[PDB]
Amino acid sequence: VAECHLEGREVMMVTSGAVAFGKQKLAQELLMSLSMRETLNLEPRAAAAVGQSGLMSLYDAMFAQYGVKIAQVLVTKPDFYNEETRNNLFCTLSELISLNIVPIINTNDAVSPPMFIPIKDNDSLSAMLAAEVQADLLILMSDVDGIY
Amino acid sequence: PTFTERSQLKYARRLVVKLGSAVITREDNHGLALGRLASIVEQVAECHLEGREVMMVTSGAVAFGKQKLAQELLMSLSMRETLNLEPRAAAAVGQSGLMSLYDAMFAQYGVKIAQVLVTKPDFYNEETRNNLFCTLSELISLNIVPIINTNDAVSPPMFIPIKDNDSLSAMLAAEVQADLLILMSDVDGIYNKPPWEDGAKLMHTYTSMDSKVKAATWALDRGVSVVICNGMQEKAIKTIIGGRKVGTFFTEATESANAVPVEVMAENARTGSRQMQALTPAQRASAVNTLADLLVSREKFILDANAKDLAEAQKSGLAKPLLSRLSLNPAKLKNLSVGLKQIAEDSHKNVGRVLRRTRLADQLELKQVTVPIGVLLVIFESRPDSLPQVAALAMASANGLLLKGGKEAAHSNKALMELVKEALATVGAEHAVSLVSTREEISDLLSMENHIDLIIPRGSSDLVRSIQQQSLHIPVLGHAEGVCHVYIDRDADLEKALRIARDAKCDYPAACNAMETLLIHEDLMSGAIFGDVCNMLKREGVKIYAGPRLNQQLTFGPPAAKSLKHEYGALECCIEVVPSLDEAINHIHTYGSSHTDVIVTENDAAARQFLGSVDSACVFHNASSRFADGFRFGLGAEVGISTARIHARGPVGVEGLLTTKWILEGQDHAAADFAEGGGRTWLHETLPLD
Amino acid sequence: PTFTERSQLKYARRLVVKLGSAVITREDNHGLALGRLASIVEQVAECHLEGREVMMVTSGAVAFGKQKLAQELLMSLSMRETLNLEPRAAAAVGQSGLMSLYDAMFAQYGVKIAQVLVTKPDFYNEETRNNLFCTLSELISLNIVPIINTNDAVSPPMFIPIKDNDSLSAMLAAEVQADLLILMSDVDGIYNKPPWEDGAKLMHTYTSMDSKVKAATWALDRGVSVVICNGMQEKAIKTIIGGRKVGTFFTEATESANAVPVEVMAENARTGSRQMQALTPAQRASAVNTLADLLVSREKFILDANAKDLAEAQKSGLAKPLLSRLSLNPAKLKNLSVGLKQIAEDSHKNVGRVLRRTRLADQLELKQVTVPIGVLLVIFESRPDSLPQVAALAMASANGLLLKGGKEAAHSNKALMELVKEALATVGAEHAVSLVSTREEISDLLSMENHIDLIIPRGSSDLVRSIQQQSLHIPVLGHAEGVCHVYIDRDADLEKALRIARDAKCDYPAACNAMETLLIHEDLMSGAIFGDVCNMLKREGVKIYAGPRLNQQLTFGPPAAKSLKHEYGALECCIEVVPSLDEAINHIHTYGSSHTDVIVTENDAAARQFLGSVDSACVFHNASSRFADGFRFGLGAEVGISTARIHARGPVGVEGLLTTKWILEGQDHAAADFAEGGGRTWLHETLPLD
């Protein structure tokens, strides 16, 4: 992405997987808080918060290794019904992209996970976004080889 | 509110820290203030590696974002344009960068963080509010510092009603039911009037920026106790929780603690002075007389007052002097009754005595007369005896008096206070005397100006030095070191010098004016006197040190002396020996604190030159250093001893508590009238004062 | 050394900062002190984003490594062992972690860093040394902050000779030929004796820890100028380069600047006092007399001294008062010659006057006599006239005197100083008078204790307030605000009150005792007086404000007043009007600074009660507030005006410059002798002093 953005294009990442990272960190900081006796014999929201913070820090370091700068924009389900809010969000995204800054969008899992076009994950959000910003190409880097 | 006093904060279990947008970013807007951020993060990391539960509410993402956007915009113009910031985008950039910085700074301490971003609508859906608080609790209970901030990126709430990152802090710290809420703004606290005026005093306690005050009040009514400090002050959090006085403390105590706190009692007594000033002829003489019979008529009340107070203090057993000089007996009162009955008659013309009478022109006769000082402040130990004794001067000097001792002998103090305020209520129409003990935060009273006039430490040399190290911006009295000295001349009879050193040291070594050194002519070492003195010492068991010109002089000798300017207070006294009187002169001026010196000699030429040349507070001749008591001077009941060189030399009697004032009674005279155009000649005829 | 004065540091081009291992790590050894590290890195980043060239020499990799190794060792024991550090490895770990932290903190400012690790042998191969310095220069010239440290990992040099991270700093900063070298240790600077003693004074300048001193000396001889400060002090670098006095400055100036610097001149004059104390009978009277003819015999030298000095100052044109009251004329000297010739005769018995004569027992006759204060310090503006005038009191008060004005009128000051020190050299055998002007760092002299006694600001109300805001730990004299007041009673004749307000204000509005308010009875507003006063004002063009009870009272009226406690100093004077004399009383006590007040009235009952109740420094009756001059009091040449309530009330004449002392001439008396066992009775017979 850094080299496809140091070439003139305008990338805009939509990261998922804050919850998994948070679950790892919470497992560690829980196992490291039992009494010595118990050793001898994970709500999604908290994990989401921890994972989001740690992941943004990692992204920031990795990108600043290339001179690029990033910024995180956290949206929710209701923020796509207030038309004034939707327009403000897209004006913000455009103003950011036009300054050679890679935004990073993710659903505000910390206080209102949308899991509980209808936005239901970090995929429908990607489709809606890339349709509104009127991007050219939309890449879905899943874990499967494609479609069978 | 579970906390009321600023000393109960060491037990604060759940904190909530807020960082105003003026603490984070610098002024010239060229980056962060890593100094203040790292100081605050170090303080939080160590207040969280100690068991507490902190939860920061950071503001100032917008300022940081504006900086970053200014840079990344200026770095995107065409080279030609060079040669001649919506809040949302800046908020996003700043939030990301700031979280990264926090994460690095905290991970430098093993701690972990997590960011929770809330909005305005997320505080109306009760299910959402409950989920948020369950999340916050589950996070705090895992030893993870959350960091809350409004989601400025997509819905800044700027456009209890949450309107900023302050009302949010209040609402949060009220819902999590934290103990302490710290608002680290950029101002020093809270003033009564804006800082650019007169009267811009700092309120160290808010008794029950307008946004901060509003939120602080709302949050106080839910049990939370808030403290507002200056973020740009070093070691802010660790000294607030440390208990020391910093910033403004919001609390409720006013009805709980007392209604006689500090200030009016100064002005009340001050006005009482103005009143008591009108009680000169035999009136204040009666004021001590009405207290005379009172003390002889209320033994039972004051004895039991001290008895149970002596009783509850004896079990403590702090140290000898308090445990020895805190009791009370009707015997002492008879000693107290006889003194003030003499202080009754002697003070007939303290105030209102004429000093100068000079006529400048016809019907132009100025003069200069005595006036009381006003609101004193005498500071003493747990000794209920001096309190009604030195007050006998106050009611003899028509001047307002305050008092402060300690927690010990309290019950006797309150009783003795109702004794005297009564007498003033009997005659005086007003109590210009107010005991305000019980941790008045001695500096607090000391920091006051134009209310009190003079400080007089009474307790002991330990208490007086605490003042000298603390006292500032206010006149001070009272001895600090009683490093007396003696001298023996090469023609001085020994047996006198023996009993003198005997009397000077073996009378009351606890006194300030007790001698703590002694000198002799060097030629006298061959006069067998050295043994005779050390003989007298062992007769009383006096630990003797020695000085350089003595150490080399004697072979076996006594042990060495640490520093000639040292003091003992017990049966110890160095001995130095020097040939030259001039060296002896230089010795005192270089080591002696000019407190009290003496000579003993049989050559008057040395006497006359010794006395006149030395500059002690008082010199003597064939006498002890145990006369600095004022009473023995035939002067009267002093109130202390002066080391300074202004207004007071040694025994501060009654005159040391007065002050002068000029009046002038003209008829039609003016200043330019004195010029040759006006028929005004300057007579300056000093007429005899009546 | 290209720099000598601590104000020449703003132009330091190449710095070298060193960070002792006690600045980086905390005390309890539980992580870094991110507070101090981030403060130092912020200061360096902003002193390097300003054009300078910094180059840090960090120490303390070993301590950080020891912490990390303790952790990673305690976290590697078997669970059973839990239930009941070679320098090299710690150095490696600490170096890596510390470089990472530095890199993050600096990249927060856009700056870039690079680490250069040297050893002991790398300073002997001359080709290696030259390559190293070429590398350092090539790095610095690219706006990159290098960070040098000894390669502790594989060859710690602990086991000019490089022996630590200090000698390395000296060698480096000498080879790169830097300008300033900062050693940020953990101590406050350099003391003469170790801090746990008496005499542990901080040397603010080292005139040409033992390792630091050794390296600092060696580095000073190569042009480098070193400064040693306390790393644990906030904003250390930015205030050193800022020029302010912090830490110890190593320099060479002593022979360059002067040989009469500060301290001895105090004690020299102090000893001169001891000498001049022996010049009472017509001697110090001659001392002013030998200066009397001197001033009438050296006009040419002093006129040209001031003439060219007036001349070189006129082109500057700072402001009116200096530009107006700096010139000198033989006319002024004739005015100067007549004053001190009167000061000659009047001071015949200032020192040595008996105050008390009381006999306690047979051949036991104490007394109390006058004594000079000692080493004064009077602070004044560019006014060569007062200097030989107030000094005429010093030589009349047998007390040591210092002086400090400014750079203006300097040549006249030095000349006037050689005038007087001569007179003392003629009679006095010693000059107990020393002018030490030219930026004595007023606080420096003020910070001194037991050398000087009293401060007397002379310049103007601006100068005196600078003292009051600065002055501490030392007695102070001198007025601060001359907020005078007047009052008119409801039975007071108008035309008198007219000329009084006329005279009080239109004589010299620049005076401190010039009235800056005026009150009238409310009933008198219907007596046509209000116009008559404002009529008189416009006759002189006096800008009039008004107060609350006046503002509402009049409809058209004059403009409003900012604050009743304000002062003008020019032709401006508020007017308030109040019915109650008691309110008028309360008005002064609440607003007036008790400096100088007056009444004008035809009802004596009001007069008697007004005067006695008010507590100004001096009150009057049918007269102006323009009498506070001492000379007009028929008292003598005063030296100022006292706002305080101790030792001095209004015009400090000659008595205000003396002090008392007790002597006692016994024969064989002792303290315990007074007890009933010894035949000693207390007579206390006050005998008439001769």
Numbering used by the authors:
A (entry chain B): 88 to 128, 140 to 214, 228 to 259
B (entry chain C), C (entry chain A): 45 to 128, 140 to 214, 228 to 276, 295 to 776
List passages from the publication reporting this PDB structure.
Filaments in three conditions with (1) glutamate (P5CSGlu), (2) glutamate and ATPγS (P5CSGlu/ATPγS), and (3) glutamate, ATP, and NADPH (P5CSMix) were imaged in cryo-EM for single-particle analysis (SPA). Long and flexible filaments of P5CS were observed under all the three conditions. After 3D classification and 3D reconstruction, the electron density maps of the P5CSGlu, P5CSGlu/ATPγS, and P5CSMix filaments reached resolutions of 4.0 Å, 4.2 Å, and 3.6 Å, respectively. (C) When all substrates (MgSO4, ATP, NADPH, and glutamate) were added to induce the reaction, the long P5CSMix filaments were observed, which is similar to the P5CSGlu filaments. We chose the P5CSMix filament to display the details. In the helical P5CS filament structure, the GK tetramers serve as the core of the filament, and the GPR dimers form left-handed double helix structures around the central axis. The overall diameter of P5CS filaments in all three states is 180 Å, while the helical twist is 68° and the helical rise is 60 Å. In P5CSGlu/ATPγS and P5CSMix filaments, the additional interface between hook structures pairs locks adjacent GK tetramers. The hook interaction forms strong contacts via hydrogen bonds (M119-R124, L121-M123) and salt bridges (E116-R124). In the P5CSGlu filament, the GK and GPR domains are likely in a stable conformational state, while vibration may occur in the GPR domain of P5CSGlu/ATPγS and P5CSMix filaments due to the binding of ligands. We propose that the interactions among the hook pairs are required for stabilizing the filament during the transformation from the P5CSGlu filament to the P5CSGlu/ ATPγS filament or P5CSMix filament.
The bifunctional enzyme Δ1-pyrroline-5-carboxylate synthase (P5CS) is vital to the synthesis of proline and ornithine, playing an essential role in human health and agriculture. The P5CS molecule contains two domains, GK and GPR, catalyzing the first and second steps in the biosynthesis of proline from glutamate. The GK domain catalyzes glutamate phosphorylation, and the GPR domain catalyzes the NADPH-dependent reduction of γ-glutamyl phosphate (G5P) to glutamate-γ-semialdehyde (GSA). Our results describe the assembly mechanism of P5CS filaments, in which the GK domain forms tetramer and the GPR domain forms dimer structure, and both domains form specific interaction interfaces.
